[PDB]
């Protein structure tokens, strides 16, 4: 009865340790995304400094260009603070493999055919870059279910020499009107996240709607 009491006391503290390792393993992956953010905040802060140095030098030589540089400095600080907010809120970063699963189910529930010819999966992008691409792919199909009025949606995920490109095309009609990049909207927010990551967004509304989201590789 003493050793059976002592075994239960050790079984209770081993449950607090092998199970408490699963709680502390969450901080290991959060440190991977925090170090990803710190790396690109270094690039962002260097850009703010250099663009301020340039706008200051232009105050007399070209005051209109100085004002243009300062609108750009303000935007870099606004968007790079939006990313800090995202990791201070501890919002879940989705893996591109998991987001591709959800978009197929969202497109099928809305009765839109999903076209996907699987190729080699991206391997040289950061977890933060991959999380941005997931949010962009999720917003792209959300726009196709609500506005496109398309029969099919072709998604491509490609790993190129210096970047990862995701193309999302629907065979519907683009419902946007002149300023299709309005404040607090998905397209503007996609362009902001992609540009913070040093990637890009290109929209081809000829023959439907084709979003091309590119994001760079590491090293």
């Amino acid at each position: 009865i003493k050793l059976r009491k002592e075994i239960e006391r050790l079984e209770e503290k081993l449950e607090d340790a092998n199970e408490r390792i699963a709680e502390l393993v969450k901080l290991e992956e959060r440190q991977r995304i925090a170090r990803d953010l710190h790396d690109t905040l270094g690039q962002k802060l260097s850009l703010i400094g250099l663009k301020s140095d340039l706008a200051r030098k232009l105050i007399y030589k070209d005051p209109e260009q100085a004002a243009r540089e300062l609108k750009s400095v303000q935007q870099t600080a606004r968007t790079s603070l939006n990313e800090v907010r995202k990791i201070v809120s501890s919002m879940k970063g989705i893996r591109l493999k998991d987001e591709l699963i959800n978009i197929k189910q969202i497109l099928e529930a809305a009765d839109i055919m999903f076209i996907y010819e699987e190729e080699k999966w991206p391997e040289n992008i950061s977890l933060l870059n991959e999380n941005i691409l997931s949010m962009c792919l999720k917003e792209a199909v959300t726009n196709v279910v609500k506005h496109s009025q398309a029969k099919t949606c072709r998604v491509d995920i490609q790993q190129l020499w210096k970047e990862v490109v995701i193309t999302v095309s629907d065979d519907g009609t683009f419902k946007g009107e002149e300023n299709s990049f309005s404040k607090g909207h998905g397209l503007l927010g996609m362009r902001e996240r992609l540009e913070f990551a040093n990637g890009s967004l290109h929209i081809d509304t000829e023959n439907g709607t084709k979003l091309t989201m590119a994001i760079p590789n590491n090293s």
Binding site: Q43, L50, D53, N198
Partner: protein, 130 residues
């Protein structure tokens, strides 16, 4: 006149750096690139006076590109954001004339370009810490 090649992967940064150096009366940006390969391709063909070069660039890196332009006579200044293990060492082994922090004032960078052209070598204390 001092001709300059700038290699930087960050497009917004590559723009500002080019505009800042161009503003100097005695300097002019003769080429711009986004990878170490663009720097290698340019200095091999055109051969400028000075090659300002980022470290972390996709494709070929700035250290990798310095390692390939070792026997070219082009004065390479390296710029980087974070002091990382092995970067300082790899840069001195390559024979770079300058190793500076990217966000250091334009006045300092412009000075370093003139100093490097007068045979001197300028290295940054912050980039050699621990």
């Amino acid at each position: 006149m001092i001709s300059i090649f700038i290699a930087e992967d960050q497009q917004m940064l590559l723009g500002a750096l080019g505009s800042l150096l161009n503003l100097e009366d005695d300097m002019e940006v003769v080429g711009k690139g986004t990878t170490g390969q663009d720097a290698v391709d340019f200095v091999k063909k055109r051969q400028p006076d000075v090659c300002i070069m980022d470290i972390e660039m996709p494709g070929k890196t700035g250290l990798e590109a310095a390692e390939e332009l070792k026997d070219t006579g082009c004065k390479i200044i390296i710029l980087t954001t974070f002091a990382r293990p092995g970067y300082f060492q790899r840069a001195i082994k390559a024979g770079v004339k300058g190793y500076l922090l990217k966000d250091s004032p334009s006045e300092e960078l412009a000075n370093a370009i003139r100093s490097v052209m007068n045979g001197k070598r300028i290295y940054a204390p912050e980039l050699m810490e621990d």
